[PDB]
Design a protein around this ligand. Structure first.
Ligand SMILES: Nc1ncnc2c1ncn2[C@@H]1O[C@H](COP(=O)(O)OP(=O)(O)OP(O)(O)=S)[C@@H](O)[C@H]1O
Ligand SMILES: Nc1ncnc2c1ncn2[C@@H]1O[C@H](COP(=O)(O)OP(=O)(O)OP(O)(O)=S)[C@@H](O)[C@H]1O
Ligand SMILES: Nc1ncnc2c1ncn2[C@@H]1O[C@H](COP(=O)(O)OP(=O)(O)OP(O)(O)=S)[C@@H](O)[C@H]1O
Ligand SMILES: [Mg+2]
Ligand SMILES: [Mg+2]
Ligand SMILES: [Mg+2]
Ligand SMILES: [Zn+2]
Ligand SMILES: [Zn+2]
Ligand SMILES: [Zn+2]
Lengths: 48, 628, 228, 547
């Protein structure tokens, strides 16, 4: 239950039931992003 | 060192004296001696038993009485009272070593033992806390008013370096202030370090507002309030609205740039709780066999009716109705398609001064889940579900209302007559489908409202009319009136001897209440009601068919003959449901013929008492065989 | 360089405990949840769910070293699925099609479908026939001149109390693929017909709810039709 | 080293709040005002302890003068910097600190202006000697406090620029200066607090009797010793009002009150007596309430229309557009263990009536607004004056028909006094003579048997006693209730309102008040008979048209 969540469950997989009040709008996160240096013109890729 | 040497203080302050290493070692040694060989001159060591109990129960809380430590080492008691912080830390270490001695593997499972000091001698109220109580142990009584959620506070903080990526060792986080590090010991840099929550250990944290109880406040003055901080094992032990007594360190909270509004260096104070003592429907096997022993006797149900509302005199029929509502029947769903309600709704319609509100508060005290609501009042939970935004927290909350909140319980509605339209629609939806549908703020759902309803109402004009039937004596319409299984009408008719007994009862209650001066016990009855509600589930068998169907056809013809409002099938349904509740009173798995006869009696008495007196005179003679 | 970057979607959910089991003097507690990729847009607000996830930590800028907890959603399971147009399914398995065609060849189909309507209600066989005709409906029209003629049937049941009219309404609500049971004055907090209110976050008009728009393509069972 | 507080008192002149001027800043003064809000007792940093960052060595006994300061001396010679320090509140020294807000007195307010508040600060032993709702005389020093709200006010606001004349500079390169505004407001720092009477002019009896001297206690004993003490008490209540002895009896018993009993199961029996006065216009109903508020201590006077739900019970108010919310006590809290006087109870709307009967039934006020949740005490007797519907009292209707107020209001009033205006020659002549004599003779036309001060002394002495029901008194109560119900039975609709069990409880409460009036510890059946007579004459008969 949601009231029984203690500090012993931190960074552990827990299963909990409940009801949903609100679902937010979809934010846009970046998986693969290509970057370029401003003056150095060095190209790099970051995969997250 | 010695205790006599410990009494003499060489440093400037107590905290500096206790912080000294040889002094701290002496304190730890004496605390270990007190923890090991203290006895109450009875041949038994109580603290070894407590250590063994917490070891076998896997608990990190050790209860240490203050009077024992005071009579054993009074200098340690004075030192604990004056500077409790490092003394409590030292005694936590001592108790950890002590429980490690009994259990060598207890270190890897807990690695932390909290000592809960009990029976502190002095007791303070919240309004007499002063400058001298700062950084000292205090014991204050109060009502818990509001509490926050349980949050994780850093305990064993592990950092990582952003240059090399190495995760650094655990650092203990005290509750006073944030800890920080500046050296890596791997790449030898002072740059940015980051806390990772994956390897950091956390403890539970809670904030509780403690208010002075209104019975102890001086007349013209306002009740003071404090913030109490609850650590890992003390979370969720005090519900709001209850009286507790909390012992803890009265310390000074730190805020940035002080308070600019006051213009003075004014500090806020908090109480870090070391222990909480409160100033439960759990039954044991002995409680079970006591319930069975008190079940087999023949006249227990009357005794149950005798035990309902001891402060109310002479109103036996409504006591029977409330007892049946508290026990209840069983709800059923034949083949999934067709659902039959299993809880009895009671309507107490009465003139003012008939003590209906006292009975409602009795149900509040007695029932497992009793939710109180009112129509005219405002300082109560509403009957309507809503989605509300907190102005300060800026978050949404879905409140089910009193009907949803009383699911698998009872809802106690005071002043049922004067509800508004929205509450009336909520009540009708709650008794119709036993569910409440909400479509608000993007939330479209349904909530279960399987709640038994006991309502209190006043007649139109403030006085019941016997010549006029119940339909025109209330503002309730027919669909909301027909859902009640029992319609208990109480009228304060004049009677010389009845007024004599009522006056003597009230005057005796007043005399017994002066400060200068056969019923079941309540604490057994509460668990008995819960046990019957959650374990019995009676069923009625097939050869009892020939009597209830006979009496139904017998009384429908009489209702036609008298020309009243008709008896429909739900009257038979209420007869059967009240009969199955009478079986739960006896802790019986089957419904007997006596339960059926008693349910028929109570339903017939409820039906004829709601009639016009011209109908009543015919109906009492017509139904004399079933009323008995 | 945005034209050569790859992005995904992320959603924040807010989950409260069940309002049926809450202490009377306490505000019910909720948690913030983060989901991403194929776990977004899988639930609507108001549904009852079971969330598997990592109970984890974030610091939001009341305790010198304090942290706000949240849930990393790893999987979502829905206990019940609400009925609507968008939540409806039109795909059918082949064995279900064979069973439905084999059912239709029964010459006693009218009698079995009338008997299956509320077997616990004695009598009212013509009302059960009315319920079957209500559930099937008629053929909708789109005429060349633009005006449409409806195929749905409207059935009123008025009579003395205690005659299983409300039970018939509840059975129709339970048996229909899409149905809303409501009163004449609506529900406790769910209105009737169509309610247009402003958005709580953007202050813009949107359709909040109402029994007849939530049950489009279905049945609204309106008890107490006279008070309205 | 302890902190010594020098308290000066009994100044030759007491100044108002509006007579406070800027030439008296930093000077000894004595002001007076009504305390409206009080703060929690808090620690104030007196002698701070600081650690230098580079030294890592602590210094002690640093004087704090109002705003938070850090010393720049740094007597340890380890470093060469002065500004950087760290405060340790563990070994620092503190003082008690309370900030109570006071308001102008009702008679001191000018012709058209609203009262202006002042935040007066108590430190040391003077903390918690000020209570919300009483008039207090504060002796102290007029101090000055930084104020930020004067930014947008008209006029040239003074500023403090750093003087740069003796500083040598070079134009090497690579011009900022620290300038602050000097805006201020007047506050008061009180060293002595004395609470003067809220009137115009401690439950145990022993602690009260040690307070009085020999002559006053002898006066108390000779006043108690009188056999006609009850008649003197009744005729001494509201001497300006002619007639209406029953209302004076009810007011006296309301002032005396009954005992509070708590049942073992947990419910509390109400000992406060509530009085409602209904009747024709110009029947001196408001004169009683004005007398009660001007005479009884801890009493507040309220108009029905000018009141509010937050004003009657408690309000949650926001100060200076900040995140902090404070609780301001309402009229039911300033009259705690007193009498709340409400004229025009009929003009009060439904919501305030609901908010006041919640506090009447529960004896508490519950607050859940904003982030504040609290439960406050409202043990207050209520003296209400109401007009009937249509102005005139319709004799043909019942009491409930004439009054628009709700049934929970009606059920909690112990006594209803209906005053009827009947035109008779000798009564009108005597009343007119009394009124014109009052106007002619000022105070000389008022000759009560007891003065106000000795009456208050007798009330305070009598409130310490807790009367006890005797064996015959219980049976006499039972018989009185039975015969009242028999009177209801034979009257049918002729009674204005019916006697119920609530009337029995009010009879017990009135008997306790009467036993308090005669200063006895046991209740005599004569007191029961007098209380029954008062409650019976409270109810009047309704006339029905002949058929
Ligand atoms: N039969 C009774 N036994 C014991 N006390 C009673 C009885 N009838 C009335 N009383 C008392 O009379 C008072 C009635 O108070 P309430 O219960 O508030 O009245 P009520 O029944 O709620 O009707 P209202 O509130 O005027 S509509 C209480 O002090 C009860 O203890
Ligand atoms: N013919 C019937 N067969 C089975 N159950 C019946 C029958 N007639 C009534 N009942 C039951 O009697 C109870 C009365 O409820 P309903 O009749 O459904 O309410 P309703 O009177 O139809 O609607 P109203 O007019 O708004 S109260 C229910 O438990 C029904 O299941
Ligand atoms: N019995 C009386 N004894 C002395 N003065 C009286 C008496 N009756 C009326 N008065 C005077 O007549 C005026 C009546 O004023 P109020 O006390 O306000 O009348 P009231 O009874 O309150 O009726 P309302 O509700 O104000 S219209 C005052 O000036 C009183 O001094
Ligand atoms: Mg009541
Ligand atoms: Mg119905
Ligand atoms: Mg007046
Ligand atoms: Zn570059
Ligand atoms: Zn590193
Ligand atoms: Zn230094």
């Amino acid at each position: 239950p949601l009231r029984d969540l203690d500090s012993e469950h931190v960074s552990k997989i827990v299963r909990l039931s409940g009801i949903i009040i609100s679902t937010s709008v979809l934010s846009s996160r970046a998986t693969y992003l290509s970057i370029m240096c401003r003056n150095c013109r060095h190209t790099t890729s970051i995969t997250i | 060192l010695t205790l006599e040497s410990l009494s003499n203080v060489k440093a400037n302050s107590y905290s500096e004296w206790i912080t000294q290493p040889n002094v701290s070692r002496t304190i730890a040694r004496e605390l270990k001696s007190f923890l090991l060989e203290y006895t109450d001159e009875t041949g038994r060591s109580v603290y070894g038993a407590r250590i063994r109990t917490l070891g076998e129960m896997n608990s990190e809380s050790l209860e240490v009485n203050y009077r024992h430590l005071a009579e054993s080492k009074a200098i340690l008691a004075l030192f604990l009272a004056k500077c409790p912080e490092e003394m409590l830390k030292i005694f936590d270490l001592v108790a950890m070593e002590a429980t490690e001695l009994h259990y060598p593997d207890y270190a890897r499972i807990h690695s932390e033992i909290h000592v809960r000091i009990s029976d502190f001698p002095t007791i303070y109220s919240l309004r007499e806390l002063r400058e001298s109580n700062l950084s000292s142990l205090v014991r204050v009584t109060g009502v818990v008013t509001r509490r926050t959620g349980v949050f994780p506070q850093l305990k064993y903080v592990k950092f990582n370096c952003l240059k090399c990526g190495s995760i650094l060792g655990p650092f203990f986080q005290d509750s006073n202030e944030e800890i920080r590090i500046s050296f890596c010991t791997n790449c030898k840099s002072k740059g940015p370090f980051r806390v990772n929550g994956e390897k950091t250990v956390y403890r539970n944290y809670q904030r509780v507002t403690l208010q002075e109880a209104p019975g102890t406040v001086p007349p013209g003055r306002l009740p003071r309030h404090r913030e109490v901080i609850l650590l890992a094992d003390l979370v969720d032990v005090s519900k709001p609205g209850e009286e507790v007594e909390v012992t803890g360190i009265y310390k000074n909270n730190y805020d940035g740039n002080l308070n600019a509004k006051n213009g003075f260096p004014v500090f806020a104070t908090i109480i870090e709780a070391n222990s909480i003592k409160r100033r439960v429907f759990s039954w044991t096997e002995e409680e079970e066999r006591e319930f069975r022993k008190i079940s087999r006797d023949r006249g227990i149900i009357d005794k149950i009716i005798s035990s309902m509302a001891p402060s109310i005199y002479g109103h036996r029929d409504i006591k029977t109705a409330v007892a049946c509502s508290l026990f209840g029947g069983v709800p059923k769903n034949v083949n999934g398609k067709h659902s039959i309600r299993g809880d009895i709704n009671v309507l107490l319609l009465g003139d003012p001064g008939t003590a209906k509100s006292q009975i409602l508060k009795y149900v509040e005290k007695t029932a497992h889940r009793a939710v109180f609501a009112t129509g005219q009042g405002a300082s109560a939970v509403g009957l309507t579900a809503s989605v509300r935004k907190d102005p300060i927290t800026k978050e949404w909350t879905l409140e089910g209302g009193a009907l949803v909140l009383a699911d698998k319980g009872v809802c106690l509605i005071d002043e049922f007559d004067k509800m508004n339209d929205q509450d009336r629609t909520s009540i009708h939806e709650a008794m119709e489908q036993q569910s409440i549908s909400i479509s608000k703020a993007g939330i479209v759902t349904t909530l279960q409202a399987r709640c038994s309803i006991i309502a209190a109402a006043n007649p139109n004009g403030g006085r019941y009319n016997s010549t006029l039937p119940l339909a025109q004596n209330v503002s309730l319409t027919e669909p909301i009136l027909s859902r009640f299984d029992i319609l208990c009408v109480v009228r304060d008719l004049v009677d010389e001897e009845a007024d004599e007994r009522l006056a003597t009862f009230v005057v005796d209650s007043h005399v017994r209440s002066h400060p200068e001066n056969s019923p079941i016990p309540q604490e057994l009855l509460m668990k008995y009601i819960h046990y019957a509600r959650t374990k019995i589930y009676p069923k009625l068998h097939q050869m009892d068919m020939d009597k209830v169907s006979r009496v139904y056809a017998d009384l429908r013809r009489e209702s036609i003959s008298t020309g009243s409002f008709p008896i429909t099938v739900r009257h038979l349904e209420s007869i059967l449901r009240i009969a199955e509740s009478f079986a739960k009173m006896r802790l019986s798995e089957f419904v007997s013929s006596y339960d059926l006869d008693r349910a028929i009696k109570v339903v017939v008495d409820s039906f004829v008492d709601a009639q016009k007196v011209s109908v009543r005179r015919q109906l009492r003679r017509s139904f004399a065989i079933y009323t008995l | 360089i945005h034209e050569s970057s790859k992005f995904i979607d992320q959603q924040f959910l807010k989950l409260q405990e069940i309002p049926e089991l809450v202490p009377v003097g306490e505000m019910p507690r909720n948690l913030t949840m983060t989901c991403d990729r194929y776990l977004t847009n899988k639930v609507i607000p108001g549904t009852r769910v079971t969330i598997v996830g990592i109970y984890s930590i974030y610091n939001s800028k009341s305790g010198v070293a304090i942290r706000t907890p949240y849930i990393k959603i790893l999987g979502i399971q829905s206990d019940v699925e609400t009925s609507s147009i968008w939540n409806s399914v039109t795909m059918f398995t082949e064995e279900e099609e064979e069973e439905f065609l084999q059912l239709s060849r029964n010459p006693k189909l009218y009698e079995i479908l009338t008997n299956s309507i509320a077997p616990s209600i004695f009598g009212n066989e013509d009302i059960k026939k009315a319920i079957v005709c209500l559930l099937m409906g008629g053929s909708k029209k789109i005429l060349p001149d633009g005006m449409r003629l409806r195929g749905d049937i409207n059935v009123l049941l008025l009579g003395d109390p205690g005659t299983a009219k409300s039970q018939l309404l509840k059975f129709v609500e339970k048996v229909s693929p899409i149905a809303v049971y409501t009163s004449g004055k609506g529900s406790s907090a769910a209105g009737l017909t169509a309610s247009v209110q402003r958005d709580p976050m953007t202050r813009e008009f949107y359709l909040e709810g109402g029994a007849m728009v939530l049950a489009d393509g279905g049945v609204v069972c309106i008890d107490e039709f006279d008070k309205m | 080293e302890r902190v010594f507080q020098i308290s000066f008192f009994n100044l030759p002149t007491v100044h108002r709040i509006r007579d406070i001027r800027s030439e008296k800043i930093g000077s000894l003064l004595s002001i007076s005002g009504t305390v409206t809000r009080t703060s929690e007792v808090r620690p104030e940093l007196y002698k701070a302890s600081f650690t230098c960052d580079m030294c890592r060595a602590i210094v002690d006994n640093v004087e704090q003068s109002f705003k938070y300061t850090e010393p720049t001396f740094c007597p340890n010679p380890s470093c060469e910097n002065r500004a950087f320090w760290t405060l340790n509140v563990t070994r620092s020294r503190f003082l008690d600190w309370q900030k109570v807000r006071i308001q102008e007195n009702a008679n001191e307010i000018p012709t058209g202006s609203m009262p202006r508040t002042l935040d007066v600060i108590l430190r040391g032993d003077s903390v918690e000697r000020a209570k919300p709702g009483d008039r207090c005389k504060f002796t102290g020093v007029e101090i000055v406090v930084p104020d930020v709200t004067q930014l947008g006010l008209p006029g040239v606001k003074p500023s403090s620029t750093l003087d740069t004349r003796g500083i040598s500079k070079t134009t090497e390169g690579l011009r900022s200066l620290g300038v602050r505004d000097l805006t201020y407001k007047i506050s008061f720092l009180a060293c002595h607090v004395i609470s003067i009477g809220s009137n115009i002019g401690e439950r145990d009896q022993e602690v009260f009797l040690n307070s009085l001297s020999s002559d006053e206690i002898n006066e108390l004993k000779e006043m108690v010793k009188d056999e006609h003490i009850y008649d003197k008490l009744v005729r001494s209540i509201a001497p300006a009002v002619f007639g209406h002895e029953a209302v004076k009896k009810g007011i006296l018993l309301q002032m005396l009150g009954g005992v509070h009993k708590s049942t073992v199961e947990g419910i509390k029996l109400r000992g406060d007596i509530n009085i409602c006065v209904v009747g024709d216009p110009s029947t001196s109903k408001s004169q009683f309430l004005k007398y009660v508020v001007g005479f009884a201590p801890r009493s507040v006077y309220t108009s029905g229309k000018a009141s509010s739900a937050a004003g009657l019970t408690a309000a949650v108010v926001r100060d200076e557009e900040g995140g902090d919310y404070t609780i301001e006590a309402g009229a039911l809290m300033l009259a705690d263990n007193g009498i709340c006087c409400i004229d025009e109870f009929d003009k009060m709307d439904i919501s305030d009536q609901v908010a006041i009967h919640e506090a009447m039934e529960q004896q508490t006020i519950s607050i859940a607004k904003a982030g504040i949740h609290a439960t406050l005490n409202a043990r207050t007797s209520i003296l209400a004056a109401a007009n009937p519907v249509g102005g005139r009292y319709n004799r043909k209707l019942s009491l409930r028909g004439n009054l628009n107020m709700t049934a929970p209001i009606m059920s909690r009033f112990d006594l209803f006094f209906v005053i009827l205006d009947d035109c008779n020659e000798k009564i009108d002549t005597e009343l007119a003579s009394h009124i014109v004599d009052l106007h002619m003779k000022r105070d000389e036309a008022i000759e009560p048997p007891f003065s106000a001060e000795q009456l208050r002394r007798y009330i305070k002495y009598a409130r310490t006693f807790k009367p006890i029901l005797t064996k015959e008194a219980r049976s006499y109560l039972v018989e009185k209730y039975k015969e009242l119900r028999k009177d209801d039975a034979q009257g049918f609709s002729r009674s204005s309102y019916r006697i119920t069990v609530r009337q029995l409880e009010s009879m017990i409460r009135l008997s306790e008040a009467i036993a308090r009036a005669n200063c006895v510890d046991e209740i005599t059946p004569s007191f029961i008979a007098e209380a029954y007579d008062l409650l019976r004459q409270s109810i009047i008969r309704v006339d029905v048209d002949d058929v």
